[PDB]
Design a protein around this ligand. Sequence first.
Ligand code: MCM
Ligand code: K
Ligand code: K
Ligand code: ZN
Lengths: 4, 364
Amino acid sequence: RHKK
Amino acid sequence: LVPVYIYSPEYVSMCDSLAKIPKRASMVHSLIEAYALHKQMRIVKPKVASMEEMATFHTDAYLQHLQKVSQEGDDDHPDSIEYGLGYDCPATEGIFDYAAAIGGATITAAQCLIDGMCKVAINWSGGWHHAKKDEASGFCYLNDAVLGILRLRRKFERILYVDLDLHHGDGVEDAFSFTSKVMTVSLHKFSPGFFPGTGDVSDVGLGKGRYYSVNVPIQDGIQDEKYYQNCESVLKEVYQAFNPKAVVLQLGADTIAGDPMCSFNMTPVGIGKCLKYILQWQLATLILGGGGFNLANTARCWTYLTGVILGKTLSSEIPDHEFFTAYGPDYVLEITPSCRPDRNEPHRIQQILNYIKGNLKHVV
Ligand SMILES: *Nc1ccc2c(C)cc(=O)oc2c1
Ligand SMILES: [K+]
Ligand SMILES: [K+]
Ligand SMILES: [Zn+2]
């Protein structure tokens, strides 16, 4: 999971 | 033969409520209206997506959780983290109504294309391509793009999805990863640590849908000419091999110079050329927005692109309107690229292109  | 323009004052007000892009929908519409382009299009009021329509892609468990935290505004629900709600996708009050409005708007545009009312249908407030069936992601709560494609499947046997957003269209790709009825093509920044982190050229889909997913990894600083020539070559091979009957085009403006994300270095003209190449196919085409975090620039881009669809040359000077003061200090439609290098090596670009050509040979 990445942060946008 | 006149393009459809999805709009209603209630719809724009709804889209204005997004925390990540406040008032952007109004700015986009007002600039289009200021250029009097809405008079050259068929304005269609969008309907709200029903639970069942949304359930064509999203799970009931997710939709019910989304609706639950929406009515409350509960940003502290113990289940929200696993459902993708958090920093990127906060549980804003009425967020379910917002997402249902956007989904329905794209479905409405798709229905207009099915009914033969138009050849081009436009929903600039749509294009939320990160959302998965049971998870919000990257400012996307509901994947209106997928919903639109599923609606188009009623009439069109093969659908081509083209994603020119800065980020990888992972949600749309994942939705159709196992099918050959829909081909996804995403041009995006691909670099470790950059959202969403997926979409390498080696990603081609799974099972029966193998080779029916196309990814074009791109580095920082790419400008109009290199981007278009790279986009044209890929789309040319894709069109030959896949032979689509309908096109869904995501045009996120976060690739445009001036965007705070400061990755690509595009102008709306470069994107316009990609758009013109697709329109040349003369297929039923659903136009979506997406990213874009320099609001005035995003309005500049999508207004210019609207003119491209209408085949009109817009005045260089921004006409007076509600948000005129936000267009300083030059107050012109054109956008100037930044003075930073293009990190894309020409040999790597050709290398990626040849890899894609190799993959598309399996598409028969
Ligand atoms: N993913 C992402 C990146 C940057 C952000 C800022 C600067 C503000 C915000 O509210 O959310 C962001 C999300
Ligand atoms: K993209
Ligand atoms: K696919
Ligand atoms: Zn984006």
